[PDB]
């Protein structure tokens, strides 16, 4: 009848489960599991499954959808809490229903069940906008139209399992219920160029950080439905965002080529720049081919409290620590160079030697942009993706100074837009579902239309771990 | 020697695309090959960026001729998708034009790349 007694009773059931699982793995370690719970609560990179994976048997399954130009997807995975012991999900009929929330440029948000790793993601529900949510004033701070009216771009599910937020090119943030997909609130950015770029919930909390196109970032309070803070300092658009359990938030701007590590505790920020020189790289190679200068850095995943990875546009993948201003491990062309165009199309003249002369050999080769890049939280592995149709997973070393390619997956076709990983199973065995919303065009602008066999949909790769 | 005359290396190409974004932000860059020909006729294009991967090189090779006529230098980018991305637009532009404006705070930058571009030519 007493809450301390009930907490102790839940702890008794917890330790009973711990000892029975210990007996199962047997057919010290319990305190190790407790310390694992503490490391989950806060720790550095501890999930060290970078060798137990079986990538060659990873079952691949592409899912074509009717909606076109998928922009983002958000997986909700309910986890059991450590301090309390009910769940992180809200309802009872859920009981840990793995959810997916996809937003597509047809102004459509769609929720799926992905609770099974052998079947296909089931289209649970949906909500589509339109031109009836076109606002009447078009010149004021009021943008409270209950649906979206222009070019949704990004989505983020709240970790409590109660709400889902959506933002797009209509400079609005509409948060909805996750069951009826009813707009529970809408926050206008109160801007002319305040378009929503990318969202970031603080892990295990409602603290949502919105990277926005007006060179500023807005942090929100979701339960109270307001805008807590705005932070300024980006010289270019605040292109991508990443967050973790504590009050740090990394944002990449493209054309200043900068990684801002914003520190909420001080209100302040830290800076990171690259600067690979091709003449120095070529002179070093002569001391030992092509060397692509960094055009734009576009994607970040904050892999730890002290480390983050950044995929740029010229093929570079840079791993960073908080100790150094330099990238602690840059990486050259990841998905290879783009295939060279054709002679007849580049020249339009019957002279084939002049056609290959216009092909020019090496001077027209470009690399693949790392379009999407997702890291498993507090793990030693990460995944990258381009429009090569080759999802490339790598693992970082233990000393956190390098990463090596685990493998490639070819079930996806075209511009992969958003990647998420869902882990399931008991403590010992872990099945991982790698889901990727993938379209034929980039989410920001079109810039390309001819990718052979690129489909609008989601690619699912289910892998197990064993070792 | 192909018809693809001056095409910069990686770092030079990077930095002109960065002046491309800043001039598109300050409304100092015009978009399109036909519009580039128009401002060539206008005499207000200060220099020209063009592509190399178009359908074909010729519809933008019509521009260097008028460039040597109206002493307005020019260079090539490898990727027109990259050129439209630095233009800041969903479609790949193949030809863009840096104009003239005396009350522009980036004019030292443009005169800098003008020195570097003339030493390239």
């Amino acid at each position: 009848e007493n809450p301390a007694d009930k907490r102790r009773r839940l702890a008794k059931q917890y330790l009973e489960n711990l000892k029975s699982e210990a007996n199962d793995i047997l057919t010290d370690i319990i305190a190790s599991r407790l310390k694992e719970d503490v490391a989950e609560q806060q720790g550095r990179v501890f999930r060290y499954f970078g060798d137990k994976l079986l990538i060659s048997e990873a079952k691949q399954s592409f899912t074509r959808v009717g909606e076109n130009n998928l922009t983002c997807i958000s997986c909700f995975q309910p986890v059991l809490n450590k301090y309390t012991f009910e769940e992180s999900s809200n309802g009872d009929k859920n009981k840990g229903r793995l959810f997916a929330y996809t937003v597509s440029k047809d102004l459509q948000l769609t929720k799926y069940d992905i609770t099974d790793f052998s079947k296909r993601p089931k289209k649970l529900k949906y909500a589509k906008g339109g031109a009836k949510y076109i606002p009447t004033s078009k010149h004021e701070y009021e943008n409270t139209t209950e649906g979206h009216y222009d070019e949704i771009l990004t989505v983020a599910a709240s970790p409590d399992g109660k709400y889902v937020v959506t933002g797009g090119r209509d400079r609005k943030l509409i948060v909805w219920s996750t069951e009826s997909l009813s707009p529970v609130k809408v926050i206008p950015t109160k801007d002319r160029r305040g378009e929503v770029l990318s969202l970031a919930f603080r892990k295990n909390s409602d603290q949502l950080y919105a990277s926005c196109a007006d060179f500023k970032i807005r942090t929100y309070s979701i339960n109270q439905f307001s805008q807590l803070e705005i932070l300024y300092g980006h010289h270019d658009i605040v292109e991508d965002i990443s967050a973790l359990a504590m009050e740090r938030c990394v944002t990449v701007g493209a054309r200043d080529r900068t990684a801002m590590l914003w520190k909420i505790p001080d209100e302040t920020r830290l800076t990171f720049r690259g600067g690979d020189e091709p003449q120095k790289l070529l002179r070093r190679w002569m001391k030992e081919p092509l060397f692509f200068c960094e055009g734009s850095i576009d994607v970040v995943s904050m892999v730890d409290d002290f480390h983050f990875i950044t995929g740029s546009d010229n093929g570079n993948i840079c791993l960073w620590s908080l100790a150094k201003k330099k990238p602690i491990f840059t990486e050259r062309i990841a998905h290879g160079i783009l295939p060279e165009p054709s002679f007849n199309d580049i020249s339009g003249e019957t002279d084939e030697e002049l056609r290959k002369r216009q092909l020019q050999g090496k001077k027209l080769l470009q690399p693949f942009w790392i379009t999407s890049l997702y890291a498993i939280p507090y793990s030693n592995v990460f995944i990258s993706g381009s429009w090569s149709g080759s999802l490339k997973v790598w693992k970082i070393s233990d000393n956190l100074r390098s990463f090596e390619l685990l493998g490639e997956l070819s079930g996806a076709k075209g511009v992969v837009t958003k990647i998420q990983v869902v882990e399931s199973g008991k403590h010992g065995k872990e099945k991982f579902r790698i889901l990727a919303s993938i379209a034929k065009e980039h989410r920001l602008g079109r810039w390309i239309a001819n990718v052979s066999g690129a489909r609008n949909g989601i690619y699912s790769a289910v892998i197990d771990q064993t070792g | 020697n192909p018809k693809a005359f001056p095409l910069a290396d990686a770092a030079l190409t990077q930095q002109i695309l960065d002046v491309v974004q800043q001039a598109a932000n300050l409304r100092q860059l015009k978009k399109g090959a036909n519009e580039a020909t128009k401002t060539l006729n206008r005499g207000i294009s200060e220099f020209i960026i063009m592509a190399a991967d178009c359908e074909p090189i010729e519809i933008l090779l019509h521009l260097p001729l008028l460039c040597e006529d109206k002493n307005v230098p020019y260079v090539f980018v490898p990727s027109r998708v990259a050129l439209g991305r630095a233009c800041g637009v969903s479609r790949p532009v193949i030809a863009a034009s840096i104009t003239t404006n005396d009350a522009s705070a980036i004019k030292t930058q443009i005169y800098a790349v003008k020195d570097k571009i003339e030493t390239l030519l």
Binding site: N344, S347, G348, D351, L354 | -
Partner: peptide, 23 residues
């Protein structure tokens, strides 16, 4: 072009006729 490509001429007329059909 010293030796023009009637393939490009024909596909250009094809896009023109696609617009004419789009009328």
């Amino acid at each position: 072009s010293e030796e023009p490509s009637n393939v490009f001429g024909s596909v250009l007329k094809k896009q023109v006729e696609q617009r004419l059909e789009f009328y």
